[PDB]
């Protein structure tokens, strides 16, 4: 599959997605119109582990890189195990500019 990633802007309210790769559209079944401007949490559902979601919150708070695995859902409701890579990206002034989130689909341990 093509590379699945989104880029968020934490200088906007609730860190919305401002770019979604074609691979992300493919992986999640959503259209670019249905993704842009929302927080990445929209992929979570009932089976998503809340301890892992907390770990994500904390990494985003402390602006630190993290890799977690967690259950997400496609538009039509299919489960998929998301090995999610989050990385802060700072400008040359050392100010947080974006977050990049890269998803790999599958059961990875
Ligand atoms: C760039 C980026 C990509 C993200 N991608 C995903 C994702 O693919 N799946 C997911 O469940 N959460 C993803 N998140 C996590 C949620 O956006 C959110 O940070 C997490 O649920 C914790 O915050 P909350 O407790 O307010 O929901 C991503 C966050 C960022 C910054
Ligand atoms: Cl967030
Ligand atoms: Mg939540």
Author numbering: 1 to 109
From the paper:
miniSOG (for mini Singlet Oxygen Generator)1 is a 106 amino acid flavin-binding protein that generates 1O2 under exposure to blue light. It was originally developed by Shu and coworkers for correlative light and electron microscopy (CLEM) as it both fluoresces and catalyzes the photo-oxidation of diaminobenzidine (DAB), providing high-resolution images. Novel applications are being actively developed since. miniSOG was engineered from the LOV2 (Light, Oxygen and Voltage) domain of Arabidopsis thaliana phototropin 21. The absence of a structure of miniSOG so far had prevented to rationalize these observations, which we have attempted here using a combined structural and photophysical approach.
